[PDB]
């Protein structure tokens, strides 16, 4: 009858919707897996735990001299040691060549910061005592702004840096 007809017809269509639903979610998983097998995957932070002492990173080791923070580690590869701190980035600016693989190694001497490079997929949290490692290749020369996008205290809204990508 009409309530029992309704109920049978409602459940029949709900079974199809649920099968379509799973099919769609499975296609999204396939399209995500594809991103993991391309160069676009370098913006995923390294899983390795790489521990540092935030109390000495400004006095000893590769963050202590910002003018020597850009190191050639490969024939078309540079590693950049970046400090995010209350309230700025060192070095400033970061100067790198177009077309090279850049390995950013970012740490904090104080609180958590963001490292978000406007126009790119570089978007990583920076934890004191830990190194966040991301890689990217800049295809276009010019100036790219670094935005701090994790609340770090009262100076947060003014915490900006600069990458200059040279031809």
């Amino acid at each position: 009858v009409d309530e029992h007809k309704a109920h049978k017809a409602i459940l029949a269509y709900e079974k199809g919707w649920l099968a379509f639903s799973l099919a769609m979610l499975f296609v999204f998983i396939a399209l995500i897996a594809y991103t993991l097998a391309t160069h676009t995957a370098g913006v995923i932070p390294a899983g390795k735990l790489e521990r540092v002492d935030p109390t000495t990173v400004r006095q000893e080791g590769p963050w202590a001299d910002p003018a020597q923070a850009v190191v050639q580690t490969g024939p078309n590869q540079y590693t950049v040691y970046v400090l995010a701190f209350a309230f700025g980035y060192q070095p400033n600016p970061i100067e790198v060549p177009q077309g090279a693989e850049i390995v950013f190694k970012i740490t904090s001497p104080d609180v958590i910061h963001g490292f978000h490079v406007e126009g790119t997929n570089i978007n990583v949290e920076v934890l004191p005592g830990e190194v966040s490692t991301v890689r990217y290749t800049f295809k276009r020369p010019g100036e790219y702004r670094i935005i701090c996008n994790q609340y770090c205290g009262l100076g947060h809204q003014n915490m900006f840096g600069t990458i200059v990508v040279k031809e």
Partner: protein
């Protein structure tokens, strides 16, 4: 009243609801000022003349997040998911424990509130170390949240007293929802309890010198995902079991409602790395595993969409609506208890779509920590959950107090829910669009007025929303106090039954309900999924602790 001697659970429920709506009012006063800020308009000089204890944008944002997303939502969950099962079973909760629950929540709130008002815990509702708040904040928040463990016991007690008196009977539908809701929350709560007892409390008291921020975030987001299902499920309970009656219809399936709730018990907790896609020192394989489980936790809401839609269509046809769209106009759009949750469900369509993008691992690098994320979650908690809670006052407050709602109060209610809904949709456009233009969340951007020139158009939307939602808030305050400070009482409305829906039954129903009634089995499975999803990363992290000093940067 003779009412409260027979049904004292009515007065305890009322104390939860009112304390929650007071928290919502105070938290929401900061909302319009934050929307004006995301429109490049600095109104904080004016707010500081009216509330001179406010020292900063970020102290306001801390009060906003804590009072709206932690305090209001918890106290609503505690009111609905203890009272509705009690009334369905026609049984009295342990009133000693129910009053204890309330006093824990009230004392936790007062203790946490003190350092928040005095500018000693401007760390936001996520309180990520090494930003170091006052010990009273962590202690107060700890006690507030643990009040829910008493809630859990009260409902498990109700269920086992009913089962002992009805051997061989299946759990009734509302009590079933509340049981798997409270068992889910027990598992969910353990991350934050562990973060508080092992780390934040001893650190805050000066008994350890530092905390490992990667450990703290990992334990936080154990609780931090499922707390949003904790906010949602009491709204879903009303939308499944009460809204169909208010629409003029019936719930079309008891089993597909139970199954949605069972999938939330299983899939709500083991998902938290979707908040940690951009964190160092978590293996990308585990991030992919959490992103797949996150896509699965969407399924019970995709199912809810179909079950609810089919039940509203049924009600509309029974009320004489014809064709593909005439069922919509036949629904009772004059009844605020109907309109509020339905507008909430409409905004939840784009809200849910944003959630699925956020879950998809590498796509999160586009949106993480931008204005996109507040755009997403205002459609989920600030619209669906809050509008459902506002609508429930049209049937729940007469049922607890015997105070009637005038025709004039009804019409004012309709204006409030329409303006709240429209303001949230307008703000959603502004924040999603600003987010795609790289505008950060959690930022006093009105203090750097030339930094985001590309966002001038979406900023106009955020100004409009701020004004519309300011008006909605003032009308809501006036309406709520007109009903609570009204002198007229009619005790036969306090004795009336709750408007529970009837269900359409089918031959299938009995065999699927008894498999889902094996609650001990399904709880075991949910617990095992948490161990597998978290255990291997936590042994990694705890093996390699790197605690760091605390900072005050405000």
């Amino acid at each position: 009243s003779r009412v409260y001697e027979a049904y004292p659970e009515k007065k305890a429920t009322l104390y939860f609801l009112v304390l929650g709506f007071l928290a919502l009012i105070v938290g929401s006063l900061f909302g319009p000022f934050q929307a004006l800020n995301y429109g490049n308009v600095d109104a904080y000089p004016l707010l500081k003349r009216l509330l001179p204890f406010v020292q900063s944008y970020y102290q306001g944002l801390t009060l906003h997040g804590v009072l709206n997303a932690i305090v209001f939502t918890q106290l609503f969950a505690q009111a609905i998911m203890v009272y509705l099962p009690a009334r369905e079973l026609n049984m009295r909760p342990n009133m000693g424990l129910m009053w204890l629950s309330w006093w824990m929540a009230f004392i936790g709130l007062v203790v946490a509130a003190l350092p928040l008002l005095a500018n000693e815990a401007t760390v936001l509702y996520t309180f990520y170390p090494p930003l170091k708040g006052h010990w009273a904040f962590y202690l107060g928040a700890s006690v507030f949240v643990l009040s829910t463990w008493v809630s859990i016991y009260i409902v498990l007690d109700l269920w086992r007293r009913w089962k002992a008196a009805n051997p061989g009977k299946v759990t009734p539908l509302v009590t079933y929802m509340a049981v798997v809701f409270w068992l889910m929350w027990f598992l969910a709560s353990l991350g934050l309890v562990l973060e508080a007892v092992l780390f934040l409390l001893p650190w805050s008291f000066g008994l350890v010198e530092g905390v490992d921020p990667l450990v703290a975030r990992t334990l936080f987001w154990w609780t931090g995902h499922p707390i949003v299902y904790f906010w949602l499920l009491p709204a879903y309970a009303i939308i499944y079991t009460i809204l169909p009656k208010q629409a003029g219809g019936k719930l079309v399936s008891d089993p597909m409602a139970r199954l949605a709730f069972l999938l939330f018990l299983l899939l709500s907790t083991p998902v938290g790395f979707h908040h940690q896609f951009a964190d160092p020192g978590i293996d990308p394989t585990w991030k992919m595993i959490h992103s797949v489980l996150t896509l699965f936790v969407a399924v019970p809401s995709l199912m809810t969409a179909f079950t609810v839609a089919a039940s509203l269509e049924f009600a509309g046809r029974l009320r004489g609506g014809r064709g593909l769209f005439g069922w919509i106009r036949a629904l009772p759009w004059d009844n605020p208890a109907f309109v509020a949750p339905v507008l909430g469900l409409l905004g939840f369509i784009p809200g849910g779509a944003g959630g699925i993008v956020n879950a998809s691992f590498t796509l999160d690098y586009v949106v993480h920590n931008t204005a996109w994320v507040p755009g997403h979650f205002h459609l989920q908690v600030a619209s669906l959950v809050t509008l459902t809670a506002m609508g429930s006052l049209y049937w729940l407050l007469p049922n607890l107090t015997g105070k009637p709602i005038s025709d004039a109060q009804r019409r004012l209610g309709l204006a409030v829910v329409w303006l709240w809904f429209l303001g949230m949709m307008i703000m959603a456009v502004g924040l999603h669009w600003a987010g795609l233009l790289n505008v950060p969340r959690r930022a006093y951007i009105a203090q750097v007025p030339d930094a985001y020139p590309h966002a001038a158009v979406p900023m106009v939307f955020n100004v409009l929303a701020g004004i519309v939602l300011l008006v909605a808030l003032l009308l809501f305050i006036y309406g709520l106090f007109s009903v609570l400070l009204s002198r007229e009482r009619k005790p036969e409305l306090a004795e009336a039954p709750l408007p529970f829906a009837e269900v359409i039954s089918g031959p299938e129903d009995r065999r699927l309900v008894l498999a889902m009634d094996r609650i001990g089995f399904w709880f075991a499975v949910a617990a095992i999924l948490v161990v597998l999803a978290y255990g291997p990363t936590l042994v990694q992290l705890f093996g390699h602790l790197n605690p760091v000093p605390g900072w005050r940067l405000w």
